[PDB]
């Protein structure tokens, strides 16, 4: 558009040789490749050399010079905030995106209750988990719970734990997080045999302890491990 205005405006082409008289050769400095440079030269807050002479060309420069000024200081302004606020995430969030990459190898106990969830999973993402859990059966499927915990700290491995077992492994290891949602939703039924005489006797005793909440008064202190001072006061980082 700078070349467009420069080839239609008459308040334009001015003769060189100022020291010498009239000299009817006709020249203006504008070409496309020049205007390829003056726009970039404006964009870098530099200016090539050229000062557009028509006011119509000065509309082309000045609005671009204004668009120059808006973008660049806005760039500095946000770039403080990333250094300042520092919204740090090692994110990868849901069931879907965590299955898009396999560095987040799905730790689950072989012949597990997690396995039985992934074996008969009917949700399309969770069904496709079972495609590559059994594939790297060697590596992606751990031998036990404590086995999967140790792999997460060493590798970038990821192991599946129950919500209240999550609760204390984050509590015993303060620099270790849960990532994602609440995938499974079941309970801890106390195990008696089939056709057991011990069902209702143990059943009401649980309900008698949940009456005062004995199970939770036990839960609040056995899941009270170390301190874990959740977030820490940061400091500005010289850029690396």
């Amino acid at each position: 558009v700078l070349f467009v205005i420069a080839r239609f405006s008459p308040y334009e082409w001015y003769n060189p040789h100022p020291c010498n008289p009239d000299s009817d050769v006709v020249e203006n400095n504008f070409t496309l490749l020049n205007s390829f440079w003056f726009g970039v030269g404006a964009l870098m807050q530099q200016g090539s050399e050229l000062m557009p002479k028509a006011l119509s060309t000065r509309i082309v420069g000045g609005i671009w010079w204004f668009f120059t000024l808006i973008i660049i200081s806005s760039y500095t302004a946000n770039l403080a905030a990333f250094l300042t606020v520092e919204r740090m995430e090692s994110p990868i969030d849901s069931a879907d995106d965590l299955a898009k990459q396999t560095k987040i190898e799905y730790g689950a106990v072989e012949d597990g209750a997690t396995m039985t969830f992934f074996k008969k999973s009917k949700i399309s993402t969770y069904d496709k988990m079972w495609a590559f859990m059994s594939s790297r059966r060697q590596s992606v499927l751990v031998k036990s719970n404590e086995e999967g915990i140790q792999r997460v700290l060493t590798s970038d491995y990821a192991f599946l734990m129950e919500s209240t077992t999550i609760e204390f492994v984050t509590q015993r290891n303060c620099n270790l997080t849960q990532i994602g949602g609440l995938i499974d939703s079941k309970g801890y039924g106390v195990g008696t045999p089939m056709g057991s005489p011990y069902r209702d006797k143990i059943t009401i005793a649980i309900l008698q302890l949940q009456e005062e909440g004995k199970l939770h008064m036990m839960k609040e202190k056995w899941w009270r491990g170390n301190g874990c001072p959740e977030e820490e006061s940061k400091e500005a980082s010289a850029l690396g």
């Binding site: 006709v26 070409t31 119509s56 509309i59 668009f67």
Partner: protein, 58 residues
């Protein structure tokens, strides 16, 4: 795009409004060409023809 993007309209409006004055520059000096020798319209052609001559770029 939501954050700043109205400046692109303010960008483009500069490209809009410059059209009004660039054609304003042409016809007004054409009037001075039509004041001296030409009438109104045989002025406005003959410098526009040598704009197409365009004094070869490179």
């Amino acid at each position: 795009v939501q954050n700043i993007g109205g400046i692109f309209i303010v960008l483009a409006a500069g490209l809009v409004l410059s059209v009004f004055v660039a054609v304003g520059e042409f016809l007004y000096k054409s009037k001075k060409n039509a004041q001296l020798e030409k009438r109104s319209f045989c002025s406005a052609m003959v410098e526009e023809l040598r704009m197409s001559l365009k004094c070869q770029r490179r």
